[model samples]
Target chain A: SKKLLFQFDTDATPSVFDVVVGYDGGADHITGYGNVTPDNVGAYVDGTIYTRGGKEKQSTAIFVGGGDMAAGERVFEAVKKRFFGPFRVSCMLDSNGSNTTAAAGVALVVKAAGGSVKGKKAVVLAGTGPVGMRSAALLAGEGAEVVLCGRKLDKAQAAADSVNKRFKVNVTAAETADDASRAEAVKGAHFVFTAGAIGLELLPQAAWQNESSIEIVADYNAQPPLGIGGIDATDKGKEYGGKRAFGALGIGGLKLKLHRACIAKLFESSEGVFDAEEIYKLAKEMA
Target chain B: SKKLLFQFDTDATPSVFDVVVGYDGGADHITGYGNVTPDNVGAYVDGTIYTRGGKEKQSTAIFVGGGDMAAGERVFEAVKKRFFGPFRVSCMLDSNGSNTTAAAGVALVVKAAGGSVKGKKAVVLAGTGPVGMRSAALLAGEGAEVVLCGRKLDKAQAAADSVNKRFKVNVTAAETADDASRAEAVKGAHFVFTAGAIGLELLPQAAWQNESSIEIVADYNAQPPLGIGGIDATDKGKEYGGKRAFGALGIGGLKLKLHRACIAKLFESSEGVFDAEEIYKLAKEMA
Candidate 1:
């Protein structure tokens, strides 16, 4: 697509919807918004009326998930605040991958058992990283009894403490560096998920293979030798001993599509909210 | 050949440039340059730098002229204070249109006389308007004893007093509406210029024909029937009675070109003094 150049003062920055053109790739040369400059702008009035003639392109603005997640969420909201009903574009907000990846990870487990998410004891290994913390939040948000596992008890405790503060949901943490601890964390867990870093295996085949109650298992790694043993990166609805599993690559198709769709819907209406709950709703809507 | 744009704060009332561009087919996009907002910008630390890749384009940024000539000079000077060094762009300052139009009007008469402006007596009819006052200022700056004629004697006196106080120039007032005053104003004058409002005819043709002492005449109105009677609108060097004349349409070609070229040059160097006198120098340089 040819670029439509907009030359303005350096002191000004264009909104996300300011550059959006519809997916048709046709003659929507910067349509549907007015030029918002420093003058005539007030804090009370959302200054998104600057570009008044562009198409509603599907694109999401990301904050790169850095600094503190809570603080970064404010910055994310500030950039997308003007994208209400008057806006013609769509976008999504994912602070620390708390929404998209968590939704995908939990969905795989529910789909595998041919069941709903409630009444399941889900143990999330390595629930200390951004993805793990967010996955814990999502599971707890959905009323699941979740054991947040990490290599150190203090790190796991701190992660649970922060999640509980934000969402008011209960999460218990257990150290899972050795079998005794791993078994302890996995005890009475119907589903197990390893969201550990790439190339690090959190659970061996012996533990989950012998656990009669473990019905579904998933690993959130796409690199070689899945993050959880016996779960292939290509696994999607693959069953092992009445348990079913999915790898990151299999679930990523939906995640990427959700991301793109979320971006397209960012400025469609003021009511658009693209957090974990909202993203899940959008994914379900598409399905 | 292309349209020129003037971007300024929307709060400020558009000035002479706005009037010029509005009538002259240039695009005007008003923005808030420096004001309060969430994204409020401070005074442009670096004077607006307009460049096209490595090569430079002809552009200018000027401060508005004030009621006070001295204060106007300071603001106009401050607009170009940061500009320095060699470049293609040139600029001229005219807080009172004291530079471009005045010097151009005087230059036309000087050329019509087939001699320099030295020792010439020029009568500036309606010399109370901004253009008329600047015409008087330029003629006096060019060594001409200028007659600043106005509809009211007090208005003429006020113009003369300001010039006398500021530049120590000798400017006399004449009531051009009255026959005795008009005749008295042109007595011994070698050149006459009319810079008045639209459809304003200040000098009768019978008077110009009777005044044999007048060697040359220049008028700054391009409208029909002429601002100064008996001179054709197309008359440029249209010789008559051993005298020469420059009609509004005739000298217009030079004035328009000079106005544009002078604006482009004002940003080329810092510490520039672009006044009526400086405009004359620029005209000479361009010529």
Candidate 2:
């Protein structure tokens, strides 16, 4: 049977990364459509589901990816509403790879902390962003106490509330505008993840470096002046200030591995839906 | 169980068409490389053949494509010479869809003429170009008396001589500069194919409109001013001035169909090597 992957992107031009990965992930025929929106996705969805019949339909899959996570979510919803019964094809929503990447990051932290993610206090800096919000939700879903930190408390709370409501997980909001605020956000936290903007330092060394409760510190910033200070970009499970540290590349390596693995897993069944929760479960197993 | 395709492009970037068709052709994984040349293709060839074990290696294939057919041919030659015994991966060299498109065009004429193409007089206008030369060679391969026509006699003869030496087929050359010369080349010819540049007219109405011996006239030029006069761009098996005619779009419909069919056929087995001859053979069956 031939596997066909349809990539519905919310942007004007589909991301080349998504298309290439579709091929790498074992999609035999990948048709990429750009500028896809919730308003116009139904017809395209109908076209795909109606084209193939019965077991052959399993050979077709959908991948929702774009820069904007929110828009991608809308497209994903439109794609799902069109399918009923066995007509539904396997689908994945990774918008900017936020779900998978964050899941991988959190999974790594859980691994290093000796599978003690439950009941752990975790802080996600710049939690208003796509990766940050997903990481916060995944952490909360794992029974960890999570605080979504952003420059503005209101914006942070909005993102935190969205994830909490959608996943039925509890996550609080916090402001991290300066050293004092950042220090307060990570205070007494056992797991800290910085998903802040590139080249911006989300946490200073004084914020959590010497904190006795902190067990793992991870950064998702690949650019210079990483999200967390006192951690090298190449650090992977390196001890820093008595706590295990993971740098951007360390998390990135696992993110790519997870991405390919997930793609391979997509074909194993026709009904798999790889969203944040599902991806996190897989990441948990792999990490 | 998964098929992997390797695309070797001679330019700095591979054609998006070539990459997409690899997926359409049932390749689970497609690895594309750009700026590849005869000098550097050996290592890449060795990598694919040596990485897989036993019959599992048959899942691998190669697609050679780029804008420049000559450069693509050099890379193609390099890829073939590097393999021997069970180490060889089946490869196809289309190079801008010239081989497939030309094969489709020639197949259309063969279909319209009915039965044997052997000993039938056929003239290919603009015979120095890529599609033109291939169409000329394929026609000759079918045992047709072919005349490679161009504005310059030397250029036309050079193309015809090249095909004759390479394929061990007979093809004559002629310069169709003026009305009389154009008429002279197609006199008593059973079929005519105009593969001239876009928007250029190679045969005027007086050239072949009333030629009683001509059974079919096909034009590969899609732009304005159909290469063969009295033929509309949309004509398909439409009678024009006492001859069956196929316009550009008419032939284009079959070309696209054949392209998709050939791609689908590529996955039937890893031993399939689709070139001009093979593509022409398949097109012959389809048309």
Candidate 3:
């Protein structure tokens, strides 16, 4: 009869943030396991189903998480194999806070540009990583012409290839190996989103603050040495040189609530897999 | 800068109760991991030390837990080999809650017996499990003549031998394979503590009420078909038919507070191991 959340983390430690959301989303009780792989997850899944029964099983769900998206994806895939035979619960995968973080950033960017990125040129920095790749795929899926920029072209192209084949979206890649090269990656883009590594400034003020075609700039780093230099870290959609700017903490206003809503949705059905697209759709709905 | 709790569990899932106690114990954040073993615990321990400080390393502690005391013990022992030099945090081992749960019940029993078991005869039922074995050892160490009763002799004797050897306490074993033998095990006992399985009743009402020699009864099973047949589950040292009775829920009042204190104690010193004996000693002080 209790609303239970079974959180599976691929890291050596369970994410405290996931624990917070599970409880905040109204789970009455929670079972968290860390360093969990596909091999050891069957028993954990079986216990939840067999112990909380009579279709009250719908009161439970699984949250697959970790700091590494690659590990989380593999673990989430394994999680699927363990659930079948009329014994199931809803599941959500959002490794490294990628789903809602990217989802909220993209939704805010889309909203600033009149609710759509269709037919527009957009750029995402550090595109080889989870959040950047997801943000790139999301914008491309929204009909925008998107390019993912990373330090190396090969790795960036591989990520774009995964996004293209995995989601059937067209996304190109560029190399932001140097300063001028960084500025060149965003040349003539309508939107700019930064999902770069912590404290790494991918684009300086000299790059895009004066560019008229750049209608929106969103940065995921709220810290100093932000991804898009010269934009205030607290800007939600504040206009700067006729373009809207979104800082991580500002997009955070949407990010926190979006994840909670997604967490709450897991228990709404006995089955579901809330992935990037599903989470992106929900973020836009809220935005 | 955070009062972090790094809890390791040997099972497929981390203990939810462990999370609650750490937070309630004033841990600012928690890092819970499960499916952990002796072989893989070095990195997890190293992460806690190398990441959280310059002397603020004292803000962290490790709580080792699992439903299986045996597994938790092995993991906790392995965790010790992972630490040395100046980088270290406190550690608490309470596998299957044998430390705190047994400590609480035995403490309440001692209080009912007017503050000591120093020569009293105490019978503990279904003594093969974690809590029961620990309870028998604690009672014996507190000065009671302990006999751990189970369905068979060798298994019970084995548990008793470990407790005797490990704690240097004199504990014996008996086989309560049937009804009459069950009552006979508790014959002339001053205290009766039931640590049986969830719904198994080790002693019936008829067996105990007529015995004026039984001064107190403590039951760990709070569910229906209680361990001690007819004692009310809510009784917290309530006098019934000339004997003091303590149900699991009643003892839980002290259980919760004791564990919280133990957890809080973890952060107080950056180097200490809170095990069964330490926890038992603390419980008596609290009682």
Scored by TM-score, the top model is 3
Error of 3 at B144 (Å): 0.7
1 or 2, which is superior by TM-score?
Answer: 2
lDDT per residue as tens, model 3, A148-181: 9988889989999989987899899888787788
Lowest summed lDDT across 10 adjacent residues in model 3 chain A is found at: A46-55
Candidate 1 residue B145 Cα shift, in angstroms, is: 1.7
lDDT tens string, model 3, B142-170?
88999899889998899899889878998
Predicted complex 2: DockQ: 0.04
Model 2, span A1-287: residue lDDT tens: 78888888897545545654565577777776778999888888887788888778778888888889989988888888988887788889988778888988999988888887899899998889999999999889889999999889899999998998888988999888876788787879999999988898878887777789998999989777988988788788898757999998788777766776777777777788888978888898887
Better of 1 and 3 by DockQ: 3
* CA lDDT for candidate 2: 0.82
Each prediction's Cα RMSD? Answer: 17.1, 11.8, 11.2
Model 1, span A1-287: residue lDDT tens? 22222211112332221121111112113221223233322231232334343442332222112224554355445545544555523334454345666777776666556646686788998888766877787778777888898888999999899888767899888888775687667867888888887777777887787788888877887766677777777777787777777787776656655555655554454345566677776655543
lDDT of 1 by residue, B120-199 (tens): 78898877876677778767877888889887888888987776665668888876666557657776788888887767
Candidate 2 chain A: worst-modelled 10 consecutive residues by lDDT:
A12-21
Off by over 4 Å in 3: A1-287, B49-55, B85-87
State the lDDT at A240 in candidate 2. 79
